[PDB]
Symmetry: D2
Subunit: 345 residues, 4 copies
Amino acid sequence: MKAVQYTEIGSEPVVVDIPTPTPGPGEILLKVTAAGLCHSDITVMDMPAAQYAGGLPLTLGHEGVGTVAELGEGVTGFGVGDAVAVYGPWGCGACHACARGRENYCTRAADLGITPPGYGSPGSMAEYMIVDSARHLVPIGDLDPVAAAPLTDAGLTPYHAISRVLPLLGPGSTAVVIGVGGLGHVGIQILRAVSAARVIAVDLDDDRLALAREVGADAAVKSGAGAADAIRELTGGQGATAVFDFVGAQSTIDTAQQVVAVDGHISVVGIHAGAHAKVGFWMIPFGASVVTPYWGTRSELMEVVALARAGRLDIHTETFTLDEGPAAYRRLREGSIRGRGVVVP
Amino acid sequence: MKAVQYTEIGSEPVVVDIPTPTPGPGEILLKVTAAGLCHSDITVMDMPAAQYAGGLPLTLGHEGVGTVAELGEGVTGFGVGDAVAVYGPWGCGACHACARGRENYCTRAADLGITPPGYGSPGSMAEYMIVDSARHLVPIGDLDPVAAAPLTDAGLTPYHAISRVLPLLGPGSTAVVIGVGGLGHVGIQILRAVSAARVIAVDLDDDRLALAREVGADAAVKSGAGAADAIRELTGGQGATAVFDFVGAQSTIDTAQQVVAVDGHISVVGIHAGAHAKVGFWMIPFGASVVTPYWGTRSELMEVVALARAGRLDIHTETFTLDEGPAAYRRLREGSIRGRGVVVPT
Amino acid sequence: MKAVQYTEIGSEPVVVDIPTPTPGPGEILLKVTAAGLCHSDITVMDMPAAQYAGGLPLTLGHEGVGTVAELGEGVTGFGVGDAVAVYGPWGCGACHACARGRENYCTRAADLGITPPGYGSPGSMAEYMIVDSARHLVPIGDLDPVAAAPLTDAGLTPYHAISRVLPLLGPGSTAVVIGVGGLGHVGIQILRAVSAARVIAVDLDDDRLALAREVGADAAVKSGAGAADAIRELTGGQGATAVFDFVGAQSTIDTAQQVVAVDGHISVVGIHAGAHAKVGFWMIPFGASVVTPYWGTRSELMEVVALARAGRLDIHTETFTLDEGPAAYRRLREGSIRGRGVVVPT
Amino acid sequence: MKAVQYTEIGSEPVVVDIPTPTPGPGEILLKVTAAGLCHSDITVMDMPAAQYAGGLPLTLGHEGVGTVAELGEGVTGFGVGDAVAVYGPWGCGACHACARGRENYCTRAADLGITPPGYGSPGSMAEYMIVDSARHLVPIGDLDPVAAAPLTDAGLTPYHAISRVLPLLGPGSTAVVIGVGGLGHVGIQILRAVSAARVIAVDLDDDRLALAREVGADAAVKSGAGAADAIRELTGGQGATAVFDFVGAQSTIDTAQQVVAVDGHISVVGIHAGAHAKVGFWMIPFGASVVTPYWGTRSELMEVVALARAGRLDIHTETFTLDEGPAAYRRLREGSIRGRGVVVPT
Ligand SMILES: NC(=O)c1ccc[n+]([C@@H]2O[C@H](COP(=O)([O-])OP(=O)(O)OC[C@H]3O[C@@H](n4cnc5c(N)ncnc54)[C@H](O)[C@@H]3O)[C@@H](O)[C@H]2O)c1
Ligand SMILES: NC(=O)c1ccc[n+]([C@@H]2O[C@H](COP(=O)([O-])OP(=O)(O)OC[C@H]3O[C@@H](n4cnc5c(N)ncnc54)[C@H](O)[C@@H]3O)[C@@H](O)[C@H]2O)c1
Ligand SMILES: NC(=O)c1ccc[n+]([C@@H]2O[C@H](COP(=O)([O-])OP(=O)(O)OC[C@H]3O[C@@H](n4cnc5c(N)ncnc54)[C@H](O)[C@@H]3O)[C@@H](O)[C@H]2O)c1
Ligand SMILES: NC(=O)c1ccc[n+]([C@@H]2O[C@H](COP(=O)([O-])OP(=O)(O)OC[C@H]3O[C@@H](n4cnc5c(N)ncnc54)[C@H](O)[C@@H]3O)[C@@H](O)[C@H]2O)c1
Ligand SMILES: [Zn+2]
Ligand SMILES: [Zn+2]
Ligand SMILES: [Zn+2]
Ligand SMILES: [Zn+2]
Ligand SMILES: [Zn+2]
Ligand SMILES: [Zn+2]
Ligand SMILES: [Zn+2]
Ligand SMILES: [Zn+2]
């Protein structure tokens, strides 16, 4: 089968021919219908050998949807042909976090050698993929696969970040979204669907600000040195109830600390090595909590799928073939994909 | 009347004679029965002129209990003689936070010039004190005033910090308390009363570790370079569900980050200028939230008083006269008050 | 001044001339800009002498907005001319519930003789009204008074009922709204604004089902014997996550129990004496909680006002003069007001 | 192997010899170390043929602990010899409730024919038992099996009921426990461990009131007509924040409604066919929610085990052999087991 793999440290991913896998006991083989590209893939591929934890070769793609092609021995609860999304942050299934579906916060995965598809286990950017267990599949019914694939991370990750502090986001609240890319453009829509927060979007790119307004942002303002003052002009001196930073550079985290309200929240979602919030007296308002969330929970993925099925998420995509996978990663690097890149085999 | 005041930048507080105040409309005059000393008072008195926001002179004391001596015009809901605790973080009373009793997070207090007793308004370390409004008084009934005064901050502040994340502290959880002083020794007891968390106390001083065990800590660890590893040996690799850092020095915050669990919490309660948690990828576990809480809410103070009335809080105190106030602050500076210093006016 | 009063048991309310009140200490006099009629007023006026708790005479109207006309002694947190909404369920201000703004659940109001405007204290259906304290006023800025008056109960009550279980109403949930009147037509809009629930409206009257669709209901079902089956056809067998019953008749409560999901909720908001949910094994699904909520909280009223100011609430009203007050109550009795009746004094 | 089975409608259970089962793919065979008797077993055995849903024959016992004896094909995460407790309310594992571990509220179990061990699937009152999947086993380490078996229901069910409203049970709250039997005597201890509620126990039997005080109840009062007034004398006129009714007879539910506080909770846990709370205006206080909870969640069972391992639960038991199983059910019927009956297979 055709797949897109990261095969040597510091090189671009390549299109390869590798054997179509067969599911072992408990596993499910999917025919992949759509595979999302994520900026985390760039970050992973830019790591030096010592830090890179994905293994070589690695079939990329931690955003996967497909149709059930073959059931491994003993698998129940799915039929051949069922359209499913892959829950990505695989955990042990048995610990206190996993028992609540919070496998993203599994305390045993490292020790048991459990890794996600697309970063340690083979991903979705291939004609077929293996899923380890039935509990990592969520039905999508007749959802369009191209717009569904990003739900598994571009949808799930913002959804989880927002869910952590949803009770803060009542009528009269303001949520700032920094970075209107794959994640951020979905985050805006989640905020509008599950809260009455006023949503202020921030991006470097005027076309991404237009995208933000297109998907329901109440205001959209230019990132950089003037952003904090511009946001405060919109909120008045109270600042923003919550800031969801999908960039996570030091400059954006600094903007977040400069605008967050007393008893508010900053969610540092974007990943930029070395960047950090400075949480101390006189450096942040009283009661303003800060967290780096990771991916999301099983029940959250179901809720994301439910939002999509209800028409609440307009996922902006561009479609690529498997052969175009490496070119698509170049596009993502240069910032020329308006929303999410999606590979269709 | 006699009072203890901070009167010039960089000097020790002094005992003074100033007029007994009269309550204006809406105000209440208390005869003070006990006034707590807090380490925040030291921090405030060590600020340079440019930063110090308390005004001069300032009657110290933001931990106050008393008896109602006189009602100002129009005051209802209290009688002369009623024993009350002073809710300290005064807010506007009208904004969304204040409407929920969360006057500690009032968004209008700065703009309206509203300051707390003992830091901008006259405090409790005097024979009498003024309280601005009835909503800032909570009844204590027959609670001993000496042990009640610290409930207003040494109790309220840890209680609020813990309350922010109480749902995390289920059976099987671990809570670390760093700094077993005024706040910390009460924090341990709150954790034991309102949660099933295992409590690990951390202090530099072996006698404070003994105090921690005396008030119900399950384990006690020496602070410093070995603390993080020692805590992890106790929690077995998952780390601590929550860390309540009542010191807030860089070293203690670093210990906190090195032990906190995935999807846990660090509450930076202690105040050390410049110190901060570094919240970023690879610097803290996934999902481990960090906050600097401030004081507490109206309903939280009521709950702290309810814990005291139910026998759940053994408040360790040492009593001083008003004349001993300055000496008591020297004791607090050198770290020789085992628990909370409390001034009792006579 | 002109006012509409209930003056004798079993009679219709009458238009009267009574003195314009002057505010005492702590009170505020409002020039009323709009006064809502509520079905609870009908229920109150239909009570026999032994049950009726409003006092006689009683100026009706527990839905009030106005402009500050005169400040009582000591009141300084509002200016003359400020547009304000009246928080209705007055409490003591001092108990644990009141400290959280939850004066609707005040434990001391009965004992202290504290009653709401429009049911024991003089209401808003008059040229002017007295408000007891500043904490019972919420600013509305430039909101149209006619559409603002219903926010104080038609908005607040559903808002509180929904807020009690808002975490249940995630994507994929269904909320049923029974009764698309004053409260129900606002409840539909609150659900759409603060949740991703699919909303199914239920009414006896086709025109009210049309109103429901006009304000954002996803589906509309005829009430009565076929309603439970019709709702289940829409929800596909799991039933409805939450049912907000703004009628509260036995038939509607029965429908609610027949459609509610496992681990769901029924809020019995409508008041029909004798009607009740039967919460027992084999009579309701496992985990499906039931409550009779009452009015709402201070912070909730602020949130309702914020929804209105953000354009999220299209309040359907019909305007009446004070002279038309009694006629308007006849209209409400016969069910011919499409949304909320609102009296505008001139 | 030896087992205790319900074999014909209206008869007592009997000791039988049936084949020792072999685990199929995904299943686990346990050597049973302890099997709890529950009053639900009596209720089930007293159902007429038309209602009884357990199937015949049925190996009784929905409270099970054991050691892993044999792993079915493909089973990972447990080793032979591991001591485990059986999570009882088996669900589909895939729905939104099950994904959160809340298999007690599974929406698909009925349709898929999934039933619990001891009521549709073979139970724990046998030398060996099958568990359907690894996710239905929780490790207990070196906990004594006799005291561990009741954790799976006598512990789990009260724990879940309490957990639904734990945020209500702050300092100053009161929780009433009605019925100090298997469930109730554990419920008292859970309340003391995870909350600061004052606990008032209620039972018909003076020896069970003594048991209540032995396990940490603050007061213990006689059930029946005088109970509501007696409880109110202890709480003052505010009533009880929460009432956990482990009897669920009409008389006990009525007591619960007569004592519950405004904005409180009644959990109807005990099962008595036909009995129900009457939730309507004038029949219950404003804001007092009522629910019939069912069993508990996966993560809750882990938390119950954690309480036991921390020494917070003193489980009162009496031990029986398999041959004594039928005699033990007679004892439970007559009310002569002080706590939980537990069968230990040899
Ligand atoms: N925490 C997690 O679990 C998790 C999961 C998935 C992705 N992520 C991370 O989220 C981030 C977003 O990923 P993506 O795939 O949406 O990226 P993307 O490449 O699709 O979009 C990036 C967007 O950020 C904007 N941007 C860049 N610098 C900016 C600045 N200084 N201010 C404002 N806007 C700026 C760009 O113009 C662009 O619109 C990445 O760092 C990714 O690694 C985190
Ligand atoms: N956030 C707030 O709202 C708030 C409110 C009140 C007090 N505070 C702050 O909380 C802190 C504690 O106040 P207090 O009155 O309880 O102080 P205290 O002087 O009574 O106690 C200090 C304790 O901390 C211990 N300690 C000092 N350095 C330590 C270290 N490196 N590691 C471990 N333990 C150490 C001491 O040995 C002592 O037991 C102060 O910084 C104070 O300003 C904050
Ligand atoms: N719990 C509280 O705190 C609180 C506060 C305010 C009002 N209420 C109560 O809420 C209820 C509604 O008040 P309102 O002012 O909105 O009433 P309304 O007269 O404006 O509306 C009544 C609506 O219910 C519909 N209706 C009547 N019988 C019905 C049935 N069997 N099935 C479905 N629909 C039916 C009508 O057709 C109409 O649309 C009243 O009982 C009122 O007393 C309760
Ligand atoms: N909701 C659920 O998921 C669930 C789960 C397990 C058990 N249960 C039910 O819980 C109830 C208790 O089960 P158990 O095994 O603990 O029972 P048990 O037989 O061990 O204990 C019964 C206790 O209730 C007392 N009692 C009886 N009538 C009383 C009254 N009128 N007032 C006060 N006390 C009274 C008895 O004196 C005895 O102490 C049963 O109805 C059972 O079916 C429900
Ligand atoms: Zn990603
Ligand atoms: Zn796990
Ligand atoms: Zn202090
Ligand atoms: Zn305020
Ligand atoms: Zn009303
Ligand atoms: Zn009150
Ligand atoms: Zn049972
Ligand atoms: Zn299920």
